[PDB]
Design a protein around this ligand. Structure first.
Ligand SMILES: CS(=O)(=O)N(Cc1ccc(C(=O)NO)cc1)Cc1cccnc1
Ligand SMILES: [K+]
Ligand SMILES: [K+]
Ligand SMILES: [Zn+2]
Length: 357
């Protein structure tokens, strides 16, 4: 009945030296941590230390060239850093970025290890930079290494290769990197909910559509729930969990649940344009706690309204600690396009999941 929490101020050192107001701010993590203390949640958790991921651990998911390039940025001059960052889609780099990405990954490794050895039941990781857009061979969308994907593989490395890991990605953006890393893998089930807009929303790829179900042995093990034409919120997310996320997850029967918990679908986010409430995130967390004997690790991804992410992530930790879910508002009828989205995923995944028939 113990919840772990990892937070390390050193991850604030990654910064944008040319645009100091860039939304992926150092204070994202310190604000979430401060709100946990304000709400007296922090002292209810067992503190798990951060550590650096090793280069060998990074190789679980990333190419040696990509590791070596990001590693080399630690010693680069500002001119090198600016030009390297511009080689990627939506990346800024400072001399501290590599170490910060290592600490984000190693923090989650330590948290997964604590869960899998029975030291804690569940855990929350207040980490940056985020991970889910990072691919095998490249950085993207504020992410250098794929923390959640690396954690799944690390979990398998300390248990058995076939350990069933569910990754639920509720960041408003598609986790293109996580999908691609596990696209041919049946041991890691990837379920993403994301604003899609027929491919017009970042990261602007049809890879995020509902018809991408995985490849090879991973056919059926990639579930994309894409949202189009609507300011989605609690009713749509609750419905997707009831009809898709939870039935598929229960049938998969994961042994560990990782949440790529971005909070950019939250009410107030400057980029997501959605209205998931803090009580909504609490209910999503509480539902996931019914899987894998409660072995759930919540990993911060995106989310850019400092107040919204602080309240939202704190409510998730409150759920991990065993507090009762706060009451949702009256769930309005679903946006018509949300019903269309859910039906499209149901038709795409009915060949693979008997719980959907
Ligand atoms: C800051 S930006 O506007 O230039 N942006 C870059 C960006 C990359 C990744 C993430 C993230 O949270 N991923 O999970 C957020 C932003 C493009 C954009 C435009 C509209 C909506 N979303 C993204
Ligand atoms: K997502
Ligand atoms: K997969
Ligand atoms: Zn995001």
């Amino acid at each position: 009945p113990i919840t772990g929490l990892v937070y390390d101020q050193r991850m604030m050192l990654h910064h944008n030296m040319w645009d100091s107001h860039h939304p992926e701010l150092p204070q994202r993590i310190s604000r979430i941590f401060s709100r946990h203390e304000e709400l007296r949640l922090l002292s209810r958790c067992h503190r798990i230390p951060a550590r650096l991921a090793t280069e060998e651990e990074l190789a679980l998911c990333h190419s040696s060239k990509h590791i070596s390039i990001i590693k080399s940025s630690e010693h680069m001059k500002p001119r090198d850093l600016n030009r390297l960052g511009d080689e990627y889609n939506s990346i800024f780099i400072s001399n501290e970025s590599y170490t910060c990405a290592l600490l984000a990954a190693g923090s989650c490794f330590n948290s997964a290890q604590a869960i899998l050895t029975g030291q804690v039941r569940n855990a929350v990781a207040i980490v940056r930079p985020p991970g889910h857009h990072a691919e095998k061979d490249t950085a993207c969308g504020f992410c250098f290494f794929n923390t959640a994907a690396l954690t799944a593989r690390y979990a398998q490395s300390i248990t058995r290769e076939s350990l069933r890991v569910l990754i639920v990605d509720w960041d408003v953006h598609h986790g293109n990197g996580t999908q691609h890393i596990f696209e041919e893998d049946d041991s890691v089930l990837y379920i993403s909910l994301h604003r899609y807009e027929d491919g017009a929303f970042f990261p602007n790829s049809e890879d995020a559509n509902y018809d991408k179900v995985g490849l090879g042995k991973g056919r059926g093990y990639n579930v994309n729930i894409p949202w189009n034409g609507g300011k989605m919120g609690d009713p749509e997310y609750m419905a997707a969990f009831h009809h898709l996320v939870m039935p598929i997850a229960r049938e998969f029967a994961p042994e560990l649940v990782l949440v790529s918990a971005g909070f950019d679908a939250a009410r107030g986010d400057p980029l997501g344009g959605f209205q998931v409430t803090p009580e909504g995130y609490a209910h999503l967390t509480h539902q996931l706690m019914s899987l894998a004997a409660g072995r759930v690790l919540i990993i911060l991804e995106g989310g850019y309204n400092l107040t919204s992410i602080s309240e939202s992530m704190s409510m998730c930790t409150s759920m991990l600690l065993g507090d009762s879910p706060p009451s949702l508002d009256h769930l309005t009828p679903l946006k018509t396009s949300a019903t269309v989205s859910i039906n499209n995923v149901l038709r795409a995944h009915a060949p693979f999941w008997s719980s959907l028939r």
